[PDB]
Each structure stands twice: as C-alpha cells, then as structure tokens.
C-alpha cells in the first residue's frame, strides 16, 4: 500500500522514493526490506516494532546519523543490516546490542572515529563486519574480542598505524582479512597470533618498511599480498610457516635482494614475478615448488640458468628472463608446457642447435638486445609452430630459414653486418618483418 | 531444515585479474539444498523409425527464482575506475532442469 | 541569558555510571555538549568550554546544565542522556547513551 | 545402501497403436529413480566485462541411464505387423544435468 513497490515472496523495496521516516502500513510479516536510498535522519524509538519478522534490512544511503538504541529492538530474527554511506560518526554500539541472530554487519564508507570498547557486545552469531573507507585510527581490539564467530572483517582505507600483539587473538574462526589502503608501518611480532584459519590476508598500499615477521604464524594461508608498500628485503624462508600460499603479490616494491631460498618448498605457488632485485645473484632456489606456470625474474645480476629448470617445473608455461646478465643458455628439452620465452637484453652470444631443441608448444621467442653472434642452421628446425621471433641488435652474420615456415612476425632490426638475404620460398606466411641493411624486402 | 532448498549468504574478495586495482569484499548469495522430488528417467517406446530421446526425464534443481543486477566500482592505478557486475540472487526454488 | 536546562530521571535512583547533555541542530547529527560521571569527572565541549556548566544533585537525580551568555549560535534542541552500566569510557559520544530524554528547545535570539 | 539412493526398478506395461490394430504385450521396462546423494548448487559470477554471459554457475546432479540397449518387439498385428523398439536400461549412475 505504500508509495514504493513490493514482492510476492514477503520482500518489500523502497529504494530511492525520498521517503523520511520508515514507510507505514507495510505486512506484518516481512522478511526483506530496503529503505537504502531514502533521506532518512534517524530512527526513533518504535520505528521497526510493525516488522517482528524481519531477516534482511537494508539502509545504504540513508544520510543517517542518528540511532535510537530501542530503534532495533525487537528484531530477534535479523540476520543481515547495512549501513554503509552513512554519516554514522562511530559505531552504534547500544543500538545493535539486542540482534542476537545478526550475521552480516555493514558499517563501511562511514566516517568512523571512535569505537567504544563495549561494542558488538552481545552479538553471538554475527559472522561479517564492514569497517571500511572510516576515519579509524587504530585497531579496536577489545570490540573484537567479543566476536569469536566472525569469518570475514575489512579494516581498508583507515588510518591505521599500527597493530599491537594479540589484536586478533581470540578470533580463531576468521579466514578473510583486508588492510590494506592504510598507513601501516610497524607489524608487532605476535599481532596475528590465533588467526589460525585465515586464508587470505591483504596489506596492499601500506608503508611497511621490512618484511612482516608476523605472518610465520598463520599456518592456512592461502594469498598474500603486500604490493606498493616500501619493503625491501625477502630476508629467508620468509614463507616458511605457510606451505598452502598460492598467490603473492609483490610486484611493486624498491625490492633489492630477495633470500636465495626465500621461495621454497611452496608446493602450491602459480605465480612469480620479481622486478628490480637487482642484488640477486644466484638463481632462486626454487626446490619443491613444481606448480610454477609464470616465472619472471628481471633487472637482477643473475649470471647462469640452472639445467634442471623445466625438467622440475613441468607445468612451467610463461619464462621471462629479460635484462640480467644469461651469458648462456641451458637446453630447454622437458619445456613441454612453455608458450613464450623472453630473453631480451641479455648477455647471450649464441645459440647452438642443442639449445631450443625439444620445444613443441613454443609461440614466442624474444632475442632482442643480446650478443647473439651465431645460430646454427638446424637450432630453429626442432620446435614446432611459431608465432613471433625477435632477434633485434645482435651480431647475426647469417641467419637460417629451416623450420620457420610457420613463422608471422619476424624482427632483425639492428642485425648489421647481416648482409646475406632470406627469401620468400622459405618464409612464406610472414606478414611483419624489418630488416637490417636497406630494401631487403624487395623479395617481399 | 537445512535439507531445503535455502538461500546461503557469502563473502567473497574480488580484484581485478591484472590491472593494479584494490581488492575489494562482496557479500554474495547461493542457493543450496536437497530437491523433495526425486530425479526420475523413464525409457519411450517409439513405434516410428526416426530417432528420438531415448529416456523420458525429470531433475528437479534448487537454482535461483529472482536475481536483481547489481555493480561494484573498484578504485585503480592513476586513478582509473572500473566496473564489474554481479547477480545477486533473493529467492531460490526447484525447477525442471531440462526446462 | 541566565538559562538553567534542568533535567530529571524517574527510573532509577542510584547513581548511573554517566549522564551528558547533547544538542541537535534541526535535520543534523547529535554532537555532544557535556557529561559528567560517577566519581563526578567532567567534560565539555569545544565551543562550550567556558560558556555552560554541567553540575548534578546525586541525591534526587536532578541534572542542572547552566548556561549564560548563549552565542547566536546556540539554537537547538537539547537531549538528556543517561547510561547505566560502566563497560565503557565516559565522553561526548551520543552512542554509549542507552536512555534519552525528549529533549527541549532553546531559540537564542540577540 | 540407503533406499532412497538410485536404483533401477522393474515396471511392467503394455504397448499398442490405435492406426493399425494389433494384439498387445508384456513389456518390463526399467526405469531410473532416487536421489543423488551431492546437494545442488548455483553461485553468481562476478564479470568485468560490458555485458555478463551465463551469470550463474550451477550444478545439480540427477541419476539417468549409462548403458542401454535398443531391444526389439515382434509386436504382431491383425496380417501385417511391426517392430517396436524401446530402450532397455541396465544401470543407474548420478550425472551432472548441463553436461
């Protein structure tokens, strides 16, 4: 009957009509509804005693700034409130004492500054928290410690400085955890003691300036991140207490050395990119990882590849190696998985038949900048289809056409001194090439 | 009666797969339970040459009844934004697979 | 002005663990104007620090707030609010309230 | 084994086409019925895309047939006649519905 819409199935949606106060004469039993993008200023005392059996409420939206701690009473059976967007200064902690059955509790996009230390109190089966885009400051432990159910708590785009020990200690059955977009600094050597079923842990966009030590005492974790932070040292066997991770993100850091068994024994990692470690020199004792299908090490001085690269990583799928020092090159035999391989910049100078051979699911090779001074003629017949080939500035005096025929992007430039011709019998379904020297595309 | 066919709600972090962009928590909802009617396949005699499905079916599957489309913005490298969308399911029923 | 904002509690005797006094512009948030605990610590706000008072009278939980010299400023609907329990903190945060008064007007002009 | 898991029953009928009249039969048909033991599912996709394809993935087993065979009535008639053909099921085994 009122002025916004309704549902078969006991749903009542009110989203956006302007409405002021909380629309009347509504079913008694109702189980979902949504006031969130009304003007709404704040809840009186009986404004929700006509809706015993509610289960969803929603108030997004709301300019809300003011809760009357009898506002929710009576509403045993919610399980699911938003508050998000808000002018809710702190966290109604009379108010939402009395929703025993509450799981989800969102607060985000507030600007929350203050959390009394008797909030949530009470709230037995709440299960979600939202925290983010506030004016926080620091953690609030004690409110947290009175929610030994919850499964998944953001603290995002506060101001957070930094964690104390045992901030997280009884909250043993949480397994998603955001911090990221905070001014993090310092992580105290206990902080995360008794998250014991996290799986993920985000700390993104902080300011931290060594590595957590923290995280050896998370033993289910399963992705990290902590990218565009100011670490710089992977010291060893960093990630000796999470033998499940899959996924790390620390691809933008002033990265400088990382531990030569830093990544070891993670049997289930997917993924590795390292740029900028310049001080590494030998290569990554990568033993027991076999699950690699990215490896990408660059800007480093490694000087050596070792020969038992892919016959370990069997599922190994992307290789980039650009920049460094690979003066040569071990035989890729066992390559099986490899679709692109870069080596672009490097100190190779040259490439024996024995080299590339083996290699059938190949798409891209990348030679550009190296020293390559000589290629036999059969080091190109082995593999099978590709698709681009790059061997841009080395000293190339002649180059073989064999096993090239499925060749489409063909790159010399810089080859000088490269005087002999190809020919068009051989490379025939190129459509994308340069050449060093002047009009040899004449034939083309 | 956690046999029937209920509506389960779930948070899941969503980030972009390879842009520089900020994870980001989503509750999600899933439908779940147990059909009351069992799956039946009963064989058709057919007294034409042509061919023809062989078995009479019926599978009953708890899936969503009503979805309201719904978009999250997510916050990204040189103050690029993006947007992705979702279902978000509010009721579930069983229905004829097939159907 | 010599504006004397009485308050009075009539459902419980015994000292509750805190008591303020709140205001509210018309349509804006509740900001806090002054509160006072058990042991009688006090605190006000920022623009009230010198111009109001709050005392209290344990005895018959009547709760005076007094002002003078009122700022054109301070046209609002003043709140009184009690709390009773002690698991918290004592300051001008409007949500450790549990009980609220309906409050008054006070419309300063000159 | 549970009893309301699938098993394959023995129901018997009888076949007969009013175009061209004939003298019915005794036909034991299988048939293939129960409950899966795996509960059903569906859970939303979160896309980046403009424009979302297939928004939920589901599954939802149900038991049908593995192996059958296309067993052959004599079905005389009137005197002309035909063969019917039906498809005799032999085993029962739980099966995701999509695929």
Known sequence: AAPCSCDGDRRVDCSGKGLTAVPEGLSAFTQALDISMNNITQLPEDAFKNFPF??????????????????????????????????????????????????????????????????????????????????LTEVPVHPLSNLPTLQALTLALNKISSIPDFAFTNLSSLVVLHLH????????????????????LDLNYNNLGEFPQAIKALPSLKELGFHSNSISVIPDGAFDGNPL??????????????????????????????????????????????????????????????????????????????????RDLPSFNGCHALEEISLQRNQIYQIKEG???????????????????????????????????????????????????????????????????????????????????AYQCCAF | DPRRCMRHHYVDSISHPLYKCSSKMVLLARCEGHCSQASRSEP?????????????????????????????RLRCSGGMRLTATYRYILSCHCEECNS | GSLRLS?????????????????????????????????????YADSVKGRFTISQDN??????????????????????????????????????????????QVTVSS
């Open chain 1, 181 to 200: 977009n905070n001014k993090i600094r310092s992580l105290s050597q206990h902080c995360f003691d008794g998250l014991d079923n996290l799986e993920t």
């Open chain 2, 44 to 72: 058709l005699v057919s007294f034409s040459t042509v061919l023809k499905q062989p078995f009479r079916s019926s599978c009953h599957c708890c899936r969503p009844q009503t979805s309201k489309l719904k978009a999250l």
């Open chain 3, 59 to 104: 005895a018959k939980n009547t709760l005076y707030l007094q002002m003078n010299s009122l700022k054109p400023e301070d046209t609002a609907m003043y709140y009184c609010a009690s709390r009773t329990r002690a698991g918290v903190t004592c300051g001008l945060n409007w949500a450790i309230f549990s009980y609220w008064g309906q409050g008054t």
């Open chain 1, 245 to 326: 991770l899959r996924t790390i993100h620390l691809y933008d850091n002033p990265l400088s050395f990382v531990g030569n068994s830093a990544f070891h024994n993670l049997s289930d990692l997917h993924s590795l990119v390292i740029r900028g470690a310049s001080m590494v020199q030998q290569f990554p004792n990568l033993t027991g990882t076999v699950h690699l299908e990215s490896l990408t090490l660059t800007g480093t001085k490694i000087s050596s590849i070792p020969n038992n690269l892919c016959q370990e990583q069997k599922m190994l799928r992307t290789l980039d190696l650009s920049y460094n020092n690979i």
């Open chain 1, 54 to 135: 509610l289960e969803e409420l929603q108030l997004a939206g709301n300019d809300l700034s003011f809760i009357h701690p009898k506002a929710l009473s009576g509403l045993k059976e919610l399980k699911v409130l938003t508050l998000q967007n808000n002018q809710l200064k702190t966290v109604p902690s009379e108010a939402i004492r009395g929703l025993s059955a509450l799981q989800s509790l969102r607060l985000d996009a507030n600007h929350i500054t203050s959390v009394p230390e008797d909030s949530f109190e009470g709230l037995v089966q709440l299960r979600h928290l939202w925290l983010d885009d506030n004016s």
């Open chain 1, 355 to 437: 080299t590339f051979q083996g290699l059938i699911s190949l798409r891209i090779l990348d030679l550009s900048r190296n020293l390559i001074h000589e290629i036999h003629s059969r080091a190109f017949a082995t593999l099978g289809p590709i698709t681009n080939l790059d061997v841009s500035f080395n000293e190339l005096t002649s180059f073989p056409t064999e096993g090239l025929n499925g060749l489409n992007q063909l790159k010399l430039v810089g080859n000088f001194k490269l005087k002999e011709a190809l020919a068009a019998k051989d490379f025939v379904n190129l459509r994308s090439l340069s050449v060093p020297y």
């Open chain 3, 7 to 43: 308050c009075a509690a009539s459902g419980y005797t015994y000292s509750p663990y805190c008591m303020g006094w709140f205001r509210q512009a018309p349509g804006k948030a509740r900001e806090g104007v002054a509160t006072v605990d058990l042991d009688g610590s006090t605190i």
